Amino acid sequence: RSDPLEGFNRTMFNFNFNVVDPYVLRPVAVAWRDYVPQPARNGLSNFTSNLEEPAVMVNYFLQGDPYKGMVHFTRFFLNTILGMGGLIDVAGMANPQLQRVEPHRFGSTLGHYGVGYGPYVQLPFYGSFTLRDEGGDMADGLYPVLSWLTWPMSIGKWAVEGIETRAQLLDSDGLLRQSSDPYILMREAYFQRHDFIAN
Amino acid sequence: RSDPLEGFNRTMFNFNFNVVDPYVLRPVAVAWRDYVPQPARNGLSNFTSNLEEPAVMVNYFLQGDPYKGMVHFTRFFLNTILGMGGLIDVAGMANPQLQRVEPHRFGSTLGHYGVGYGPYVQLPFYGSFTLRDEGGDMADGLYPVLSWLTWPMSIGKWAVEGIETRAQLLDSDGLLRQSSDPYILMREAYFQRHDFIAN
Amino acid sequence: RSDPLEGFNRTMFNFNFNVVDPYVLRPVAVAWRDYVPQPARNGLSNFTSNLEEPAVMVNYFLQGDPYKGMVHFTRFFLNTILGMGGLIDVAGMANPQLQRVEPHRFGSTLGHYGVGYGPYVQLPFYGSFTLRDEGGDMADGLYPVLSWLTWPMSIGKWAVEGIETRAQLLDSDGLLRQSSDPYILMREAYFQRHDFIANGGKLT
Amino acid sequence: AEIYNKDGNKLDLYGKIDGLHYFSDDKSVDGDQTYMRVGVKGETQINDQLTGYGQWEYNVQANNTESSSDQAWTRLAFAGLKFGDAGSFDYGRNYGVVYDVTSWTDVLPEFGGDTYGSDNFLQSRANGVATYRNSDFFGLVDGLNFALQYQGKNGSVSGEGATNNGRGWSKQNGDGFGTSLTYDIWDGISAGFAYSHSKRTDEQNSVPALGRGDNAETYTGGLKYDANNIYLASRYTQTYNATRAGSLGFANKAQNFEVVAQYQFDFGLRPSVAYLQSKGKDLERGYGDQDILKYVDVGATYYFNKNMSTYVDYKINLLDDNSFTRNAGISTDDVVALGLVYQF
Amino acid sequence: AEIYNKDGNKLDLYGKIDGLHYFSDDKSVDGDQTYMRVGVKGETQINDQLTGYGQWEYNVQANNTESSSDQAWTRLAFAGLKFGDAGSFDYGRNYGVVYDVTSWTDVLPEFGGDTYGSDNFLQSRANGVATYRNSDFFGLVDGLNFALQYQGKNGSVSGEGATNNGRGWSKQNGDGFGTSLTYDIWDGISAGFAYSHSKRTDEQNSVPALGRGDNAETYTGGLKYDANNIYLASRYTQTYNATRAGSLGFANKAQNFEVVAQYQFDFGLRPSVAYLQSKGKDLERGYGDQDILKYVDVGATYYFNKNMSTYVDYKINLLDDNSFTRNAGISTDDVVALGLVYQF
Amino acid sequence: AEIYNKDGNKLDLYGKIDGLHYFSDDKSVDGDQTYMRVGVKGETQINDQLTGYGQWEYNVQANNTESSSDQAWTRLAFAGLKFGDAGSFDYGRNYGVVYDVTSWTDVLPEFGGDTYGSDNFLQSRANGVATYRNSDFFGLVDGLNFALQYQGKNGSVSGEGATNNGRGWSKQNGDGFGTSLTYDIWDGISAGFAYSHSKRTDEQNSVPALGRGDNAETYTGGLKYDANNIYLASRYTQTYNATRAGSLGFANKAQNFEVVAQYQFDFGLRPSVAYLQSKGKDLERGYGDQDILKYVDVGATYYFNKNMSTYVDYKINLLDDNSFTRNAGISTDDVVALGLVYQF
Numbered sequence A, B: 001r002s003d004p005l006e007g008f009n010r011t012m013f014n015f016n017f018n019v020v021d022p023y024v025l026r027p028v029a030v031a032w033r034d035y036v037p038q039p040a041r042n043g044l045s046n047f048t049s050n051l052e053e054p055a056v057m058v059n060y061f062l063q064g065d066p067y068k069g070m071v072h073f074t075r076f077f078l079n080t081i082l083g084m085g086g087l088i089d090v091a092g093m094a095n096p097q098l099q100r101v102e103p104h105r106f107g108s109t110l111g112h113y114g115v116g117y118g119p120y121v122q123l124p125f126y127g128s129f130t131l132r133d134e135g136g137d138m139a140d141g142l143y144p145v146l147s148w149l150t151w152p153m154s155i156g157k158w159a160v161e162g163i164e165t166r167a168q169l170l171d172s173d174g175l176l177r178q179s180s181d182p183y184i185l186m187r188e189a190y191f192q193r194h195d196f197i198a199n
Numbered sequence C: 001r002s003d004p005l006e007g008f009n010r011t012m013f014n015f016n017f018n019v020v021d022p023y024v025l026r027p028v029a030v031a032w033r034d035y036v037p038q039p040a041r042n043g044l045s046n047f048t049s050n051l052e053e054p055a056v057m058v059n060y061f062l063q064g065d066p067y068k069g070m071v072h073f074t075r076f077f078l079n080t081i082l083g084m085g086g087l088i089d090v091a092g093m094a095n096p097q098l099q100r101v102e103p104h105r106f107g108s109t110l111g112h113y114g115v116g117y118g119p120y121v122q123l124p125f126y127g128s129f130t131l132r133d134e135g136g137d138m139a140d141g142l143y144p145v146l147s148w149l150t151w152p153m154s155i156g157k158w159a160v161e162g163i164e165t166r167a168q169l170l171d172s173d174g175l176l177r178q179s180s181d182p183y184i185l186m187r188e189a190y191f192q193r194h195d196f197i198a199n200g201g202k203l204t
Numbered sequence D, E, F: 001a002e003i004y005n006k007d008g009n010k011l012d013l014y015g016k017i018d019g020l021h022y023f024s025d026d027k028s029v030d031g032d033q034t035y036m037r038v039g040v041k042g043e044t045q046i047n048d049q050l051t052g053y054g055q056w057e058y059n060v061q062a063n064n065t066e067s068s069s070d071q072a073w074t075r076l077a078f079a080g081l082k083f084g085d086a087g088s089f090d091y092g093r094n095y096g097v098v099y100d101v102t103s104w105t106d107v108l109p110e111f112g113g114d115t116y117g118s119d120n121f122l123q124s125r126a127n128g129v130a131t132y133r134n135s136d137f138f139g140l141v142d143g144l145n146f147a148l149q150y151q152g153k154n155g156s157v158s159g160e161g162a163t164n165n166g167r168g169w170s171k172q173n174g175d176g177f178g179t180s181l182t183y184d185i186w187d188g189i190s191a192g193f194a195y196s197h198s199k200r201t202d203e204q205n206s207v208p209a210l211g212r213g214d215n216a217e218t219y220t221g222g223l224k225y226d227a228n229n230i231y232l233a234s235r236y237t238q239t240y241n242a243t244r245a246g247s248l249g250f251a252n253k254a255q256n257f258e259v260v261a262q263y264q265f266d267f268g269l270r271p272s273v274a275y276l277q278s279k280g281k282d283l284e285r286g287y288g289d290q291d292i293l294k295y296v297d298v299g300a301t302y303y304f305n306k307n308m309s310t311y312v313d314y315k316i317n318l319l320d321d322n323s324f325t326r327n328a329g330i331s332t333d334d335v336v337a338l339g340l341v342y343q344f
């Protein structure tokens, strides 16, 4: 379909799939799954998620729907001020239309206003980078919460989110490994997940 | 039945019956009934009645009955202080035995001590007038509540009260008029009300 | 039963039984029962009894039993602070386990460790006196609150209690006066009541 | 109102809100005087014989700004046990027993009871009072009620005469005691006597100008008739070093007397006539015999039900305008009072 | 909460505890502001025609020491009767009728409603107010409500203008009166007008240096919309010698204006936008035309249920720092507030 | 007492009246000490997951005159949410978390719990604390309880360090935090630890005479046994710049220690023995190491039932009368206290 840089990508993906993942990151995720207790996993996941919910709000406004804009205002506010800086999902306990949901950020608004993705890069150590979503999302580091992160903090957040994401995927490892071509499937999942959030 | 001035009276009464009543007064009372809303009538009725309750009180004391004397103390007291300067009949709502009754005053006091009426005059615009009651009643404009009025205010008060009672009799108009000799009925009614208040 | 002074004792008892009791005291106890109203009797009895409850505790501690030790602490504290210096039995109405009971004092603890009575003196006007219990109980006038009494106060308390005890016995006096050997019963009743108080305790 | 009664415990949240306005030439008295009272009364049955209880009652002034100071205060707070046939005993801040007979004349719609103050030895509410009470004289003499009471020193804010709860001479006191006796003679008629005796503080005898004496005593006798909707009551008391001479100190000798008459009408109005009078004798500084208080009181109150009432009250104040009335800050002007009162 | 309702007597114990914190560059506003409200509401039915009532409400600040002073004060306390279709009458410390319309803009999460103060010529709660109220205009004009109200002098603490409950010029007043009228038009829209008129004390016109005039009046009109989870409201007031110029006195003329818009989300959050403004004219020391208050206010409250809610509120303060702000003591700085609120 | 429970909301009106008297050679301690407490505790059920709450409790001193000042104060007022068992959170005026173990020795009949004060960093009741609490440690260890807490500056009345809720040092503080951990071990036995850490205000480090330091730290451990009608408890805390040296300032270092033993008799009496001691080290001005508190305490309380109780408590006070006690305002004298207590 796309992939002008399919050759470039497939080499970065095979480096990621069979060098960094078996030798690091996934071992780092097995230590995570066996040594950090489930409450600390739920608390970190909510704490990081919470720093994006002000931007999810500002972007639901731009995509025309100020109702969900204030669902994520309410999520940020109950959870920052009463849920211990985001550690507890109070809003989720308070009401069903305040459950945590996947971020809709500046890439989404760009995609919802019909802007096309980049080519499709696959990066070493990173994973998948479109010019519109990853990186377009960086526009949300111009206004507060994420403009408050130093560059060290942004990677810490990046890391713990990643190791957790890997840690959750630990139990369906396979079918990326028992699959004729795991680059085309991994990429297909990419665009289906990313087109859904740009709605 | 007594009546030494019956000749004079019957001619003043016919002046009151067939020129003063149809040409003025009753037109003013039909206007009253159709243009002044019922609450303002209830308040005006209550307000003027209220100024007579200090005199009814002092006169029940003079007649040996200090109980009803203070029935009219409390009526003045609740209605001046809680019923807005007399507009609302609070005492009347507070207890059946403080409901409004017709004033007694100094004519009553004379009649209760056996004094007896004058002759019986009928006046050209006033109406039935005895020297003991309509005339003796003036004794209560000597001490406060009623000594505070301009002579204009006492003329105002008579007027408003007369127009209201006139307005109420409007639907029993047609049955003093369907009667032979209406001076005799008007005169007996006078002496029955006035002897009843003296007992 | 030992009684080295039995000869002496029966001489004083006949003085106490048929001169002091009919000629005085029992007249004093009927005047008490006929002229002092029952509340002032209960207030006086409670008040004097209360002066002994600090001592009853101090000796229940000395006998190995601190549970009833503070039962009598609770009695002293409730009744002195809330019962008007002891006049009202507040502890008694507050709970069945704090009812007044007859004192266990230093004679009791001496006896509970087995010391022994001695003879059995009988005194004129006094009644029954052992060197171990009467007199041994006097050790409890060395620590408060019973050490706080002047000797006049000690005589009053014995007098008021004595007249009251006689006043209550007024209805059974008449049934000791005919009964063979009225010295033996009074001596046995003493040692029956006084041996019960060394481990064991009941009263009114 | 009884708001709790489960497990042998009763709880009563009670009070009144009184919208009230004073008309008087005296600008210390004239104006708005709206206030409110709230309190708790609690009872706990301990045994069949024993019952424990407590009460607190608060006075809150609703007639000044929200920036204002000292608008609330505690008038009562005490706990006790009641033994039934053996009486009752309690401690806290509570009424002096002199008030067990003096209370009979404190029934006007708004005034009265001001021959004395509060925190004025044992004539009204005071800090630190233990009071034994017994009804029907130890269950012996039906209808005769007596009381005995002691009060510890309530001294200076600082100095040798200090206590924790210090205050000024006008409301200090030494150790003292009082006693009360009341008898229901016929039925509706009642006689009462009360006696009081307190040490007075070194400051009482040095900083105010009027009144010296080691002690502060009061003798009181009173009578009352209360039947067939008539209420007649009267009270005479003499005081030594106990009655305050306004702000100038205490009256060395003083005689107080009160008379009140009330009828309760079929229809809900209770009028009130009364006379009250307090005379200070052997005052110092040239103030010979001076009047402390003197007025006729005319008034009436209407009850709508057990919960709502209204009243007017007219204090016809007969004090002359002396050098002594003014230097003590004793008000000489009349006063009229209107009040509307919700109670719960 | 209705804690009593037996035999035509009802008692309501109500209040709120609000843990609340202010962030501000102004060290007078910044820090803990936790406070508490407690009150009682009482109803007694006398007849079918007549019913009597009372209410008291207390504010006590939990944001200081236990040794700290003046942390409590009475906000409301009044009793009254309700006559059915002849209305109601009350007396006590209560809200001015001016607040019958200006209350329509007093709906912010925590700020707002500060173009006026308490104890300020019947714009909000005041000492000594008698208030007649009538709903549906004597049962005639359904949905038209009017109120009439009078207030006596509350003068200086001492001196010729003194009364019993004296205070400082900023909350004094002579005799005055006010009235209010409000109409519910086509379900949800509502119009209202309010007028007030009071004499000013000699101290008002001598001590503060700013504000001269014999009387103090206010003219108010307001509209509001309350339907379909939308709430819009606005209010305009003119005042003469009535609006305070902070500590410097009163504004001889002042025009006050408020706008509020709110939406209520099904999930429980209610955001709020508002703009507020008070501009004072002809001030007396060269100040001329000065602004007294001006800010945009953005905030929101999340309601968990009828009993628990939380809120944030952000006052964006548009006052510049004049010689007049910095001499009247008017806060120039922004303020953010977070509060968690239990109410019962 | 539970006075409301309708629609999943519960309201509790609670308190106590304590008629209480102190005997002491120290005239600041001696005399009447009657007081009363009243408060509300409230609950509303929101979901199955979420439930909200608040509570306030008031201290009213009934042991002075009705003309007296500052007799009332708020000891608690806070609201919060409780997350099933993801924990709970609240904000307001509430107990410091150091008190989660230190409370274990604060059980004497009337004294004790005075190695620290209220408004003393996070050791007792404090203004402006947010407190997270969690039981059974996130479902990880049944019986281990954890707590975290922060407090913002409560500064001077004026100056750069000022806040809205200003005060003097000894009850000021900078921003601070504390944490506590307690474990229910075998049966009755419990271990606890607490740490507190707060910035100290510029005024603390400038105006008093004793104590300098940027921070104020607290480390505390304690054990307790509570089974078979025995209660034993002990607590050791070390302090840096945190415990007050009476009037002179703070002790730069101090070690505080408390031990208490109690038995509860089936018939209702609970006797208590305790020893308490606070020693402050490296103090300035020549004082060196001095004792702040040191006394044996003997007493007992009789419980009539859940609602009425009495006690005597004897503080056998072993402090010497130094140049330092007399200059810090430290009471050297013994004191005995008798109290009768109604509770509801």
Ligand SMILES: CCCCCCCCCCCCO[C@@H]1O[C@H](CO)[C@@H](O[C@H]2O[C@H](CO)[C@@H](O)[C@H](O)[C@H]2O)[C@H](O)[C@H]1O
Pocket: F259, F260, F261, F273, F274, F275, F294, F296, F318, F319, F320, F321
């Ligand atoms: C829970 C179980 C109950 C525990 C029982 C009680 C524990 C007993 C502790 C006793 C400790 C007293 O120990 C001792 O105290 C005294 C009195 O303060 C100190 O003495 C100090 O004060 C005294 C007088 O107050 C001064 O004259 C003296 O110069 C000074 O040193 C001693 O230096 C110390 O050694």
Ligand SMILES: CCCCCCCCOCCOCCOCCOCCO
Pocket: B066, B067, B070, D263, D266, D271
């Ligand atoms: C200001 C002085 C007032 C003193 C007045 C006392 C009067 C006592 O009178 C008792 C009257 O009782 C009569 C019975 O009640 C009447 C009920 O029926 C009324 C008939 O109209």
